[model samples]
Target: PIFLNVLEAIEPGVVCAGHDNNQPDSFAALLSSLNELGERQLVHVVKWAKALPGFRNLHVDDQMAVIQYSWMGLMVFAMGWRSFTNVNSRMLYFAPDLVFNEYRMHKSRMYSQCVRMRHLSQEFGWLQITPQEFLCMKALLLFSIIPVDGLKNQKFFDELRMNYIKELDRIIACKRKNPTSCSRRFYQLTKLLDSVQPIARELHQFTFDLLIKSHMVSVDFPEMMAEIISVQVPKILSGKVKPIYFHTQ
Candidate 1:
């Protein structure tokens, strides 16, 4: 109850993309607006991550590291859930204001990623995932990936992540029976969670390239996005930092 309470309490409300709907869709316009939206959401993301249970117990450095590494997956999963609840998965609801139609998805030059994100949104309904499960799963996503070598407070992170996993387990078993059915639900959820990393990785590649030639493309990355893309993200792209997978791939 406490963990659930914290998760729900800390869950962020809707954020707008501030896109100029009046403007015609184009590579630069769409991506720049998306980048602006990304910057806005990231501000909320850092605040939300800090408020997560057991998050502050880790070394201060570990806090920043994990957030930087997992930001894309965290946002992607939440956006999928938003897409699920808001539009019934008909379109990618990046934000209430920044929803993506089929045409916009193509115009973003991110059609492949949009399709994958839409699939993730559809998964929420198809699996009949509960609200509690979604909250717990989102919390777990904050801890799911980490640097390969380890965090500054590796032991603390391990314990916190384990506690969150146990919380997720408790969530699955709550008032539910049929041990096999319970395990099956756990299986489905973990597999769905795992699906998020690949798509985020593609975005990593896409944005990294875009940022490198941002001038050429007229895609303006804000201060933090530029810093994160230039610094922490490269660690992931170069394999110096790695995402954890529940199952070996």
Candidate 2:
């Protein structure tokens, strides 16, 4: 399908296209790659979402609302899939040379949150995720919407969200039929999806925190990414835009 082809073209399961060896080894080069990857991924995701039947049919505000709400969740899945292979090494690799050790990350305001997210990513067993399953996960993430102010066509989005959930269930049932690992693999995969939002919320916050702190002055945050995380309710209403509220167990 066109979506799968787009995913492959964008280097899914990896952060960037092309070999890191051919790229320059300087920190500047790494920061450039990180910026490029983030911007391109945002574009690819928008394209993929638009390509979905009925997505382009929605009111522009509704379309923007969906993408705004879900893009970070999709990104969390991508980074988790890429980092799964080396997650236990205590480093999160955004690009080849853009890796960060726990000690280095400790200087950030979100270090503790980052550690919890890392452990949660590992617990999800992302290393075992199949490409088809990943695609399903992406679809699931894209359709999972929360209430947004001034959202039009709420029922349309709610129904679409359920369709994706059902599709995910079918995939999980087939994948777990002959599973070699956890006895409750299907259950766990759903839990992974549930956990994605909070982790992503932190990752989004941390990315901006790093920028605001001038820790990576050389790196430019993608415009779309900046918009997604920074767009919130006006301060006059809530004093500050808070993270999406989800029920905690």
Estimate, for each residue in 90-183, the C-alpha lDDT of model 1 and write its tens digit.
Answer: 9999887788999999999999999999999999999998999999998888887787888877999989988988999899898876578988
Q: Please give each candidate's TM-score.
A: 0.98, 0.68
**Backbone collision count in every prediction?**
0, 0
Error of 2 at 169 (Å): 0.8
Q: What is the lDDT of residue 81 in candidate 1?
A: 95
Which residue runs of candidate 1 sit more than 4 Å off their true CA positions? none
Query: Residues 13-57, candidate 2, lDDT per residue (tens digit)?
Result: 334533254644544444445555777777777777777755666
The model with the greatest TM-score is 1
| lDDT (CA) per prediction | 0.90, 0.59
| Ten-residue stretch with the least lDDT total in model 2 | 233-242
